[PDB]
Amino acid sequence: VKDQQEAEKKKVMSQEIQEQLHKQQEVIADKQMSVKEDLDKVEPAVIEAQNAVKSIKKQHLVEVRSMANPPAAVKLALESICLLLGESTTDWKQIRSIIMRENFIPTIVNFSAEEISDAIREKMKKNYMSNPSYNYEIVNRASLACGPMVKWAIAQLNYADMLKRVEPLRNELQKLEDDAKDNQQKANEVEQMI
Amino acid sequence: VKDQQEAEKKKVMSQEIQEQLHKQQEVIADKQMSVKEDLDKVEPAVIE
């Protein structure tokens, strides 16, 4: 009698776990909407990251040694370096930042969550004064090297200030995931010990 | 055995009953202080 009643107490633990599993069913919906947002946003970033690897050494190395940089390359490279903590507007600082062999590694490392809102607004303003620039003269033939990196630079801003819309979303997701994963570990334990 | 878990459930109900019985003691304390006030006040009214 007592053993049946204690299996029933394990099942009451399982029922608290199940009000929590009802919370877990209420989930999937939030992840589906978040993954829809991610499919809208992230895929071009992955394409840009792959294209950065596709970039050949010759294309960048020949153009770094150039005596004068074309205006489109300057306009698109200054903002990229603004990401790299080396905020500057001089060509020689660009050359020094790009010379080192440690620039083949962080073409992918840069994340969209590190940008500061003021710099992001500065970059929208630079977009407004440079809207005909960027991907259009990438398509034209400005340079083969710029293309992948320039398209990488024009991105990371559609994530910023709209990841802050996902920040409360992902925080609620983390809370629900923690509660539901603890409760589902409880669920497996309860099933095993029933 | 079904009736064994039935007994579990009815005891659970008797445990809520014991919670109500604990709620009691409070009633006895309040009634005791009220009846002390009543003994202080009402007895001359009964004499009258």
Q: Which residue in this structure is represented by tokens 């660009």?
A: A94
| Contact call for residues A79 and A179 (beta carbons, < 8 A) | no
Put simply, the chain B residues between 1 and 48 with a CB less than 8 A from any chain A CB are 1, 4-5, 7-8
Residue A149's alpha-carbon distances to A73, A80, A141, in angstroms, are 11, 8, 14
Task: Report H helices in chain A.
Answer: 2-26, 29-54, 57-64, 71-83, 91-99, 106-109, 117-128, 135-140, 146-154, 163-193
Terminal Cα distance for chain B, rounded: 66
Query: A2, A4, A12: best mutation site toward chain B, by most B Cβ within 10 Å?
Result: A4
C-alpha A5/C-alpha B5 separation (Å) is 6
For residue A79, give the nearest of A144, A129, A41, A141 by alpha carbon.
Answer: A129
Min Cα–Cα distance to chain B from A10, Å: 13
Q: Which residues of chain B neighbour A5 with C-beta distances below 8 Å?
A: 4-5, 7-8
Query: How large is the angle between the packed helices A146-154 and A71-83, nearest 10 degrees?
Result: 50
- The amino acid present at A117, given as its one-letter code, is S
Structure tokens at A29: 């919906």
Resolution (A): 4.5
Is residue B48 helix, strand or coil? coil
Q: Taking the mean position of all CA atoms in its chain, how far away is CA A36? A: 14
Q: Do A5 and B4 touch (CB under 8 A)?
A: yes
- The amino acid present at B42, given as its one-letter code, is V
Q: Do A5 and B1 touch (CB under 8 A)?
A: no
C-alpha A159/C-alpha A161 separation (Å) is 6
Q: Which residue in this structure is represented by tokens 């080192």?
A: A100
| Phi, psi values for residue B26, rounded to 5° | -60, -45
Query: B3, B4, B9, B15: best mutation site toward chain A, by most A Cβ within 10 Å?
Result: B4
C-alpha A168/C-alpha B30 separation (Å) is 51
- The amino acid present at A61, given as its one-letter code, is L
Chain A CA closest to residue B5:
A5
| Contact call for residues A64 and A98 (beta carbons, < 8 A) | yes
| Phi, psi values for residue A10, rounded to 5° | -65, -35
Q: Which residues of chain A neighbour B7 with C-beta distances below 8 Å?
A: 1, 5
- The amino acid present at A97, given as its one-letter code, is S
With a CB cutoff of 8 Å and minimum separation 6, the contacts of A137 are A72
C-alpha A56/C-alpha A96 separation (Å) is 19
DSSP state, residue A114: G
Chain breaks in chain A (C to N over 2.5 A) after: none
Q: Do A4 and B7 touch (CB under 8 A)?
A: no
State whether residue A90 sits within 8 Å of chain B by CB: no
Instruction: Give the H or E element holding residue B23.
Output: helix B2-41
